[PDB]
Coordinates of C-alpha atoms and ligand atoms in Angstrom, one line a residue:
Chain A
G1 CA -146.7 -31.5 59.5
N2 CA -150.3 -31.1 61.2
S3 CA -150.2 -31.7 65.1
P4 CA -153.0 -32.3 67.4
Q5 CA -151.8 -29.2 69.5
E6 CA -152.7 -26.9 66.7
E7 CA -156.1 -28.2 66.8
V8 CA -156.5 -26.9 70.5
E9 CA -155.3 -23.3 69.2
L10 CA -157.5 -23.5 66.2
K11 CA -160.7 -24.4 68.5
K12 CA -159.6 -21.5 70.8
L13 CA -159.4 -19.3 67.7
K14 CA -162.7 -20.2 66.1
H15 CA -164.5 -19.7 69.6
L16 CA -163.1 -16.0 69.5
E17 CA -164.1 -15.6 65.9
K18 CA -167.9 -16.4 67.1
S19 CA -167.6 -13.9 69.7
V20 CA -166.1 -11.4 67.3
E21 CA -169.4 -11.9 65.1
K22 CA -171.6 -11.6 68.0
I23 CA -170.1 -8.0 68.8
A24 CA -170.0 -7.2 64.8
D25 CA -173.8 -7.7 65.0
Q26 CA -174.3 -5.4 67.8
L27 CA -172.4 -2.7 65.8
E28 CA -175.0 -3.5 62.7
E29 CA -177.8 -3.1 65.0
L30 CA -176.4 0.1 66.5
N31 CA -176.0 1.5 63.1
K32 CA -179.5 0.8 61.7
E33 CA -181.1 2.4 64.7
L34 CA -178.8 5.3 64.1
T35 CA -180.2 6.0 60.6
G36 CA -183.7 5.7 62.1
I37 CA -183.1 8.2 64.9
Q38 CA -181.2 10.8 62.6
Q39 CA -183.8 10.5 59.9
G40 CA -185.4 13.3 62.2
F41 CA -188.8 12.1 63.8
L42 CA -188.1 13.5 67.4
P43 CA -187.3 17.2 68.6
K44 CA -183.9 17.9 68.6
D45 CA -183.2 17.8 72.3
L46 CA -184.8 14.2 72.4
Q47 CA -182.9 13.1 69.4
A48 CA -179.5 14.3 71.0
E49 CA -180.6 12.2 74.0
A50 CA -181.2 9.1 71.8
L51 CA -177.9 9.6 70.1
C52 CA -176.1 9.7 73.4
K53 CA -177.6 6.4 74.5
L54 CA -176.3 5.1 71.3
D55 CA -172.9 6.8 71.9
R56 CA -172.6 4.8 74.9
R57 CA -173.6 1.6 73.2
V58 CA -170.6 1.9 70.6
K59 CA -168.5 2.6 73.5
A60 CA -169.6 -1.0 74.9
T61 CA -168.9 -2.5 71.4
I62 CA -165.2 -0.8 71.3
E63 CA -164.5 -2.4 74.9
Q64 CA -165.8 -5.6 73.9
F65 CA -163.6 -5.7 70.7
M66 CA -160.5 -4.4 73.0
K67 CA -161.2 -7.4 75.4
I68 CA -161.2 -10.0 72.4
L69 CA -157.8 -8.4 71.5
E70 CA -156.4 -8.9 75.0
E71 CA -157.3 -12.6 74.8
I72 CA -156.0 -13.2 71.4
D73 CA -152.6 -11.3 72.8
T74 CA -152.2 -14.4 75.3
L75 CA -151.3 -17.0 72.5
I76 CA -148.0 -18.2 71.7
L77 CA -148.0 -20.0 68.1
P78 CA -144.8 -21.8 66.9
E79 CA -143.7 -20.9 63.3
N80 CA -144.8 -24.2 62.2
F81 CA -148.4 -23.5 63.3
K82 CA -149.1 -21.9 59.9
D83 CA -152.8 -22.3 59.9
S84 CA -153.2 -20.9 63.3
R85 CA -150.8 -18.1 62.8
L86 CA -153.0 -17.0 59.7
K87 CA -156.5 -17.4 61.4
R88 CA -154.9 -15.1 64.4
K89 CA -153.3 -12.4 62.2
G90 CA -156.8 -12.4 60.2
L91 CA -159.0 -12.2 63.3
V92 CA -156.9 -9.2 64.6
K93 CA -157.1 -7.4 61.6
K94 CA -160.9 -8.2 61.3
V95 CA -161.2 -6.7 64.8
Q96 CA -159.2 -3.8 63.8
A97 CA -161.5 -2.9 60.9
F98 CA -164.7 -3.2 63.1
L99 CA -163.0 -0.9 65.7
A100 CA -162.2 1.9 62.6
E101 CA -166.1 1.3 62.1
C102 CA -166.7 2.0 65.7
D103 CA -164.6 5.3 65.6
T104 CA -166.4 6.7 62.7
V105 CA -169.6 6.6 64.6
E106 CA -168.3 7.4 68.1
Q107 CA -166.7 10.4 66.3
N108 CA -169.8 11.7 64.6
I109 CA -172.5 11.6 67.4
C110 CA -173.1 13.0 71.0
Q111 CA -170.0 15.3 70.7
Chain B
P5 CA -172.7 -18.6 110.3
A6 CA -169.9 -15.9 110.6
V7 CA -167.9 -14.6 107.9
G8 CA -164.5 -12.5 107.4
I9 CA -164.6 -9.6 105.1
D10 CA -161.3 -8.0 103.8
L11 CA -163.0 -4.7 102.6
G12 CA -160.3 -3.4 100.2
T13 CA -159.6 -0.3 98.3
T14 CA -159.6 -1.8 94.8
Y15 CA -160.8 -5.6 95.8
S16 CA -162.6 -7.3 98.6
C17 CA -162.6 -11.1 99.8
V18 CA -164.8 -12.9 102.0
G19 CA -164.3 -16.3 103.9
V20 CA -165.8 -18.7 106.1
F21 CA -164.3 -21.1 108.7
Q22 CA -166.3 -24.2 108.3
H23 CA -165.6 -28.0 108.9
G24 CA -162.4 -27.1 110.4
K25 CA -160.8 -25.0 107.8
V26 CA -161.4 -21.7 106.0
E27 CA -163.1 -21.7 102.6
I28 CA -162.4 -18.3 100.6
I29 CA -165.7 -17.9 98.7
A30 CA -165.9 -17.3 94.9
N31 CA -168.6 -14.7 93.7
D32 CA -171.2 -15.4 91.0
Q33 CA -168.5 -15.1 88.5
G34 CA -166.4 -17.6 89.8
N35 CA -163.8 -15.1 91.3
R36 CA -162.3 -15.6 94.7
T37 CA -161.9 -11.5 94.9
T38 CA -164.5 -9.1 93.9
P39 CA -163.8 -5.3 92.8
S40 CA -164.6 -2.7 95.3
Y41 CA -166.7 -1.0 92.3
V42 CA -170.4 0.5 92.4
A43 CA -172.1 1.6 88.9
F44 CA -175.2 3.6 88.5
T45 CA -177.1 3.0 85.2
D46 CA -180.5 4.0 83.3
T47 CA -181.9 0.7 84.8
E48 CA -180.0 -0.5 87.5
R49 CA -177.3 -0.6 90.2
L50 CA -174.1 -2.8 89.6
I51 CA -171.6 -4.1 92.2
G52 CA -168.3 -5.9 91.8
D53 CA -167.2 -7.5 88.5
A54 CA -170.0 -6.2 86.5
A55 CA -169.5 -2.6 87.6
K56 CA -165.7 -2.7 86.9
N57 CA -166.3 -4.5 83.3
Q58 CA -168.3 -1.2 82.1
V59 CA -166.2 1.5 83.6
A60 CA -165.4 2.6 80.0
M61 CA -168.9 2.8 79.2
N62 CA -170.2 4.6 82.2
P63 CA -167.2 6.3 84.1
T64 CA -169.0 9.3 85.4
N65 CA -171.5 7.0 87.3
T66 CA -169.1 3.9 88.2
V67 CA -167.5 4.7 91.8
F68 CA -164.5 2.9 93.2
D69 CA -161.8 3.9 95.8
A70 CA -164.5 4.8 98.2
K71 CA -161.9 3.5 100.9
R72 CA -159.8 6.4 100.1
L73 CA -162.7 8.6 101.3
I74 CA -164.5 6.8 104.0
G75 CA -164.5 8.7 107.2
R76 CA -162.5 11.6 106.0
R77 CA -163.2 15.3 105.9
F78 CA -163.7 16.7 102.6
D79 CA -160.6 19.1 103.0
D80 CA -158.8 16.3 104.1
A81 CA -155.0 16.1 102.1
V82 CA -156.0 12.6 100.8
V83 CA -159.6 13.6 99.6
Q84 CA -158.4 16.8 97.9
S85 CA -155.5 15.1 96.1
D86 CA -157.4 12.0 94.7
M87 CA -160.5 14.1 93.5
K88 CA -158.7 15.2 90.5
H89 CA -158.3 11.7 89.5
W90 CA -161.8 10.3 89.7
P91 CA -164.0 10.5 86.8
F92 CA -167.2 10.5 89.4
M93 CA -168.4 13.6 91.2
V94 CA -167.1 14.4 94.7
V95 CA -169.4 16.9 96.5
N96 CA -168.9 19.0 99.5
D97 CA -171.5 18.3 102.1
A98 CA -171.1 20.4 105.0
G99 CA -167.6 19.6 105.1
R100 CA -168.0 15.8 104.4
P101 CA -167.6 14.1 101.0
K102 CA -170.5 12.6 99.1
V103 CA -170.4 10.9 95.6
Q104 CA -173.0 12.3 93.2
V105 CA -174.0 10.3 90.2
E106 CA -177.0 9.7 87.7
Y107 CA -179.1 6.7 88.8
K108 CA -181.9 5.7 86.6
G109 CA -181.8 9.2 85.2
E110 CA -182.1 10.8 88.3
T111 CA -179.4 12.7 90.5
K112 CA -178.4 11.0 93.7
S113 CA -175.7 11.7 96.3
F114 CA -174.2 8.8 98.6
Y115 CA -171.8 9.2 101.5
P116 CA -168.8 6.9 101.3
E117 CA -169.9 4.3 103.9
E118 CA -173.2 4.2 101.7
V119 CA -171.1 2.9 98.8
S120 CA -169.0 0.8 101.0
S121 CA -172.4 -0.7 102.2
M122 CA -173.1 -1.5 98.8
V123 CA -169.8 -3.4 98.5
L124 CA -170.3 -5.1 101.9
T125 CA -174.0 -5.9 100.7
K126 CA -172.3 -7.8 97.8
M127 CA -170.0 -9.7 99.8
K128 CA -172.8 -10.6 102.3
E129 CA -174.8 -11.7 99.2
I130 CA -171.8 -13.7 97.9
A131 CA -171.5 -15.6 101.2
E132 CA -175.2 -16.3 101.2
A133 CA -175.3 -17.6 97.7
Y134 CA -172.4 -20.1 98.5
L135 CA -173.6 -21.2 102.3
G136 CA -177.4 -21.3 101.0
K137 CA -178.0 -19.7 104.4
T138 CA -178.5 -16.2 105.6
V139 CA -175.4 -14.4 106.7
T140 CA -175.6 -11.8 109.4
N141 CA -172.4 -12.0 111.6
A142 CA -169.1 -10.6 110.2
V143 CA -165.6 -9.5 111.1
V144 CA -164.6 -6.5 108.8
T145 CA -160.9 -5.4 108.3
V146 CA -159.3 -1.7 108.3
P147 CA -155.7 -0.5 107.8
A148 CA -153.9 -0.2 111.2
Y149 CA -153.6 3.7 110.6
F150 CA -157.2 4.2 110.3
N151 CA -158.3 6.9 112.9
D152 CA -161.8 6.5 115.0
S153 CA -163.8 8.7 112.1
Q154 CA -162.6 5.9 109.4
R155 CA -163.1 2.9 111.7
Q156 CA -166.6 4.0 112.9
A157 CA -167.7 5.1 109.3
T158 CA -166.4 1.3 108.4
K159 CA -168.4 -0.3 111.2
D160 CA -171.6 1.9 109.8
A161 CA -171.1 0.6 106.3
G162 CA -171.4 -2.9 107.7
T163 CA -174.7 -1.9 109.6
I164 CA -176.4 -0.2 106.8
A165 CA -175.7 -3.6 104.8
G166 CA -177.5 -5.7 107.3
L167 CA -174.3 -7.1 109.2
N168 CA -173.8 -7.7 112.8
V169 CA -170.2 -6.5 112.8
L170 CA -168.7 -8.7 115.6
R171 CA -165.4 -6.6 115.5
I172 CA -163.4 -4.3 113.3
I173 CA -159.9 -5.7 113.3
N174 CA -156.8 -4.4 111.6
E175 CA -155.4 -5.9 108.4
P176 CA -152.0 -6.9 109.6
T177 CA -153.7 -8.2 112.7
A178 CA -155.7 -10.5 110.5
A179 CA -152.8 -11.6 108.7
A180 CA -150.7 -12.8 111.7
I181 CA -154.0 -14.6 113.0
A182 CA -154.2 -16.5 109.6
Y183 CA -150.7 -17.6 110.4
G184 CA -151.8 -18.5 113.9
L185 CA -149.0 -16.4 115.0
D186 CA -151.2 -15.6 118.4
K187 CA -151.2 -19.3 118.9
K188 CA -147.2 -19.4 119.2
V189 CA -146.3 -20.0 123.0
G190 CA -143.1 -18.4 124.5
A191 CA -142.5 -14.6 125.5
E192 CA -143.5 -11.5 123.6
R193 CA -143.1 -11.6 119.6
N194 CA -142.4 -8.7 117.2
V195 CA -144.0 -9.5 113.7
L196 CA -143.5 -7.5 110.8
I197 CA -146.4 -7.5 108.2
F198 CA -145.0 -6.5 104.6
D199 CA -148.1 -5.7 102.5
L200 CA -147.5 -4.9 98.8
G201 CA -150.4 -4.8 96.3
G202 CA -151.2 -3.0 93.0
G203 CA -151.0 0.4 94.1
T204 CA -150.0 0.7 97.6
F205 CA -147.2 -0.5 100.1
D206 CA -148.0 -0.8 104.0
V207 CA -145.3 -1.9 106.4
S208 CA -146.7 -2.8 110.1
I209 CA -145.0 -3.8 113.1
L210 CA -146.9 -5.4 116.1
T211 CA -146.3 -7.1 119.3
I212 CA -148.1 -10.3 120.2
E213 CA -147.8 -11.3 123.9
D214 CA -150.2 -14.3 125.2
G215 CA -152.3 -13.9 122.1
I216 CA -152.6 -10.4 122.6
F217 CA -152.0 -7.9 120.0
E218 CA -150.5 -4.3 120.1
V219 CA -149.5 -2.0 116.9
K220 CA -145.9 -0.6 117.3
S221 CA -145.5 1.2 113.9
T222 CA -146.7 1.8 110.5
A223 CA -144.9 2.9 107.4
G224 CA -145.4 2.7 103.7
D225 CA -145.4 4.3 100.6
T226 CA -148.6 5.7 98.9
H227 CA -147.3 5.6 95.4
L228 CA -145.8 2.1 94.9
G229 CA -147.2 -1.1 94.0
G230 CA -147.4 -3.6 90.8
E231 CA -148.8 -0.9 88.5
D232 CA -145.5 0.8 89.0
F233 CA -143.5 -2.4 88.0
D234 CA -145.8 -2.9 84.9
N235 CA -145.0 0.7 84.0
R236 CA -141.2 -0.1 83.7
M237 CA -141.9 -3.1 81.5
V238 CA -144.1 -1.0 79.4
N239 CA -141.5 1.8 78.9
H240 CA -139.0 -1.0 78.1
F241 CA -141.0 -2.4 75.3
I242 CA -142.1 0.9 74.0
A243 CA -138.3 1.9 73.7
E244 CA -137.6 -1.6 71.9
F245 CA -140.3 -0.9 69.3
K246 CA -138.9 2.4 68.5
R247 CA -135.7 0.8 68.1
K248 CA -136.8 -1.8 65.9
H249 CA -139.5 -0.2 63.9
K250 CA -138.7 3.7 64.4
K251 CA -142.6 4.2 65.1
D252 CA -143.7 5.8 68.2
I253 CA -146.8 3.7 69.6
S254 CA -147.1 5.8 72.8
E255 CA -149.8 8.3 71.3
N256 CA -152.0 5.4 70.5
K257 CA -154.1 4.5 73.6
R258 CA -155.2 1.2 72.2
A259 CA -151.7 0.0 71.4
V260 CA -150.3 0.9 74.9
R261 CA -153.4 -0.7 76.4
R262 CA -152.6 -3.9 74.6
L263 CA -148.9 -3.9 75.5
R264 CA -149.7 -3.0 79.5
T265 CA -152.0 -5.7 79.8
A266 CA -149.6 -8.2 78.1
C267 CA -146.7 -6.8 80.5
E268 CA -148.9 -7.4 83.6
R269 CA -149.5 -10.9 82.5
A270 CA -145.8 -11.5 81.7
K271 CA -144.8 -10.0 85.1
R272 CA -147.1 -12.6 86.9
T273 CA -145.6 -15.4 84.5
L274 CA -141.9 -14.1 85.7
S275 CA -143.1 -15.0 89.4
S276 CA -142.7 -18.7 88.4
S277 CA -140.5 -19.0 85.4
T278 CA -137.3 -17.1 84.5
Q279 CA -138.5 -16.1 81.0
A280 CA -141.9 -14.9 79.4
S281 CA -142.9 -14.4 75.6
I282 CA -145.3 -12.0 74.2
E283 CA -147.0 -12.0 70.6
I284 CA -149.1 -9.1 69.9
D285 CA -150.3 -9.4 66.2
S286 CA -150.7 -5.6 64.5
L287 CA -149.8 -3.7 67.5
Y288 CA -149.3 -0.5 65.8
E289 CA -149.7 0.6 61.9
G290 CA -150.1 -3.2 61.2
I291 CA -146.6 -4.2 62.7
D292 CA -146.6 -7.4 64.8
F293 CA -144.7 -7.0 68.3
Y294 CA -143.1 -10.4 69.3
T295 CA -140.7 -10.1 71.9
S296 CA -139.6 -11.8 75.3
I297 CA -138.3 -10.7 78.6
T298 CA -136.3 -12.6 81.2
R299 CA -136.9 -12.4 85.1
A300 CA -133.4 -10.9 85.2
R301 CA -134.0 -8.1 83.0
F302 CA -137.6 -7.8 84.7
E303 CA -135.4 -7.2 88.2
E304 CA -133.0 -4.9 86.4
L305 CA -135.8 -2.6 85.3
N306 CA -137.2 -2.4 88.6
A307 CA -134.0 -2.5 90.7
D308 CA -134.5 0.7 92.6
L309 CA -138.2 0.2 93.3
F310 CA -137.7 -3.2 94.7
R311 CA -134.7 -2.0 97.1
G312 CA -136.9 1.0 97.7
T313 CA -139.2 -1.4 99.6
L314 CA -136.8 -1.7 102.3
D315 CA -136.8 1.9 103.3
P316 CA -140.4 1.9 105.1
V317 CA -139.3 -1.4 106.7
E318 CA -136.4 0.4 108.2
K319 CA -138.6 3.5 109.1
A320 CA -140.9 1.1 111.0
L321 CA -138.2 -0.5 113.0
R322 CA -136.9 2.9 114.2
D323 CA -140.4 4.0 114.9
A324 CA -140.9 0.5 116.8
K325 CA -137.7 1.2 118.8
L326 CA -136.5 -2.4 117.5
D327 CA -133.6 -3.8 115.7
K328 CA -134.0 -6.1 112.6
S329 CA -132.8 -8.8 114.9
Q330 CA -135.8 -8.3 117.3
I331 CA -138.3 -9.3 114.5
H332 CA -139.5 -12.9 115.2
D333 CA -142.0 -13.5 112.2
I334 CA -142.4 -11.6 109.0
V335 CA -145.6 -12.0 107.2
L336 CA -146.3 -11.3 103.3
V337 CA -149.6 -10.0 102.2
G338 CA -150.7 -8.4 98.9
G339 CA -150.5 -9.9 95.2
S340 CA -147.0 -8.3 94.7
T341 CA -145.3 -10.3 97.3
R342 CA -145.0 -13.1 95.0
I343 CA -142.1 -11.5 93.2
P344 CA -139.1 -13.7 93.9
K345 CA -136.7 -10.7 94.0
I346 CA -139.0 -8.8 96.8
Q347 CA -138.9 -11.9 98.7
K348 CA -135.1 -12.4 98.2
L349 CA -134.3 -8.7 99.3
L350 CA -136.6 -9.0 102.4
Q351 CA -135.2 -12.6 103.3
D352 CA -131.6 -11.1 102.9
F353 CA -132.4 -8.2 104.9
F354 CA -133.6 -10.2 107.8
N355 CA -130.2 -12.0 107.5
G356 CA -131.8 -15.1 105.9
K357 CA -135.0 -15.3 108.0
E358 CA -137.8 -17.4 107.0
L359 CA -141.1 -15.8 105.8
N360 CA -144.6 -16.5 106.3
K361 CA -146.0 -16.7 102.9
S362 CA -147.8 -20.0 102.2
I363 CA -151.3 -18.5 102.3
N364 CA -152.6 -16.9 99.2
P365 CA -151.2 -13.3 99.7
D366 CA -154.7 -11.7 98.4
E367 CA -156.6 -14.1 100.5
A368 CA -154.7 -13.9 103.8
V369 CA -156.3 -11.0 105.5
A370 CA -159.9 -12.4 104.9
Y371 CA -158.5 -15.8 105.9
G372 CA -157.6 -14.2 109.5
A373 CA -160.9 -12.3 109.7
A374 CA -162.9 -15.4 109.1
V375 CA -160.8 -17.3 111.7
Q376 CA -161.7 -14.6 114.3
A377 CA -165.3 -14.5 113.0
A378 CA -165.8 -18.2 114.0
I379 CA -164.0 -17.5 117.5
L380 CA -166.2 -14.5 118.2
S381 CA -169.4 -16.3 116.9
Ligands
LIG1 N1 -147.9 -13.9 90.5 C1 -147.6 -12.6 90.5 N2 -146.4 -11.9 90.4 C2 -146.4 -10.6 90.5 N3 -147.3 -9.9 90.8 C3 -148.6 -10.3 91.0 C4 -148.7 -11.7 90.9 N4 -150.0 -12.1 91.1 C5 -150.8 -10.7 91.3 N5 -152.0 -10.6 91.6 C6 -152.9 -11.7 91.5 C7 -153.6 -11.9 90.0 C8 -153.7 -10.8 89.4 C9 -154.5 -11.0 88.2 C10 -154.8 -12.3 87.8 C11 -155.3 -12.6 86.4 C12 -155.6 -13.8 86.0 C13 -155.1 -15.0 86.9 C14 -154.8 -14.7 88.1 C15 -154.6 -13.4 88.7 N6 -153.8 -13.0 89.7 N7 -149.9 -9.7 91.1 C16 -149.8 -8.4 91.4 O1 -150.6 -8.1 92.6 C17 -151.1 -6.9 92.4 C18 -152.7 -7.0 92.7 O2 -153.4 -8.1 92.2 C19 -151.5 -6.3 90.7 O3 -150.4 -5.5 90.5 C20 -150.7 -7.9 90.1 O4 -150.1 -7.5 88.9

């Protein structure tokens, strides 16, 4: 059944998959710094300052993920575009898993 | 070179009349309008799209709606009312509002015209980047209901930005000029300007005699615009989701935001097609939401609001001491005037009269400002 048009949708989805990887990496970088910071080297007031700069960054990461979801939500895929449908659903779930990860951090620091 | 600037509450737009036609100028992101937003960070000042993009990350140091404050007294009913909504601090400085923020980790206060000057600086830089030439001369627009204090504060914003403000002109006047309604020969003309945006609705009646303008009346609704139409759709789909899935998405801010963004886009689709589809995977608790809405359903959901736009119109006519048959020209401005039903209700109200609507209703004010800037240059 494979149609040339599904190629166009599959390409769009791959580009979104790469964007998601770029953001996921920011989250991994964030988490690595967090451990270093919390590892108690700075005075408590300066540690708090650093943790709030990190909190602001996790909020940027959440918003970047939300923007990706909004872009994915503009797609309309026929029932027969099974490959495209599976890739769309799979990518949404991935993003939601990464948002759960951001929320854990967000709701632990700079309370 | 001379430019026209529509300095808007939520968005601004800049045009230039060159080689016999107005060019609306795209910003650095390619956008023909720019968010009237200013952000202060640890390292820098952001204006426009970049400032709007990072609202969520930095909402206390990101300023918008400076037009709701410019030239007003701190104790103005408008300033008092809006404050409770804005996440940024609005300070009382000897009876005049200033915005207070952190900027490169130091606390700073700005008057509204200072914030609007930053928006104008951006619009100036936008024109300069396009023209590849310095740009100094501008016409800048304001609402027809602006008093002396608001007009002077607007002019001052321009001056602070390094602009030679040739003239401050009313928004409905610029829209009339865009359509060349002042070039029409004959006797006195009565013009209705119907301006419906994302948040606000303004109606204005002007008379033009011999190319010369007068404001006869103003009316409107502070709490009516495209956001209100989106909300009616949002509530329609939240009820649908509860009906099919017996789950309440309304407490999940991210689900409701996904739905809301999809609804606003489907609305825009319904201005040119008679149906719109939406597919949101995993909207709430893993449940996919696939749905459609017809233009007629959308119209039905907003039937009171849409018909309601005729009340300010009637009001404006009473105040202008005119009969609806004494209106010669009607001009649509504002992005929500693209809705077919609104155009039909209005075209019917004026017993079948034609509407001036061919110029992009988001750009028409800038467009008239640019025509007049080249005239005054
Ligand atoms: N066809 C349209 N039909 C109904 N409403 C429309 C509309 N175009 C815009 N606005 C222009 C617009 C807005 C977002 C866009 C996004 C992508 C591409 C083009 C866009 N164009 N609006 C509403 O005007 C208010 C002020 O804009 C908002 O309530 C908005 O809904």
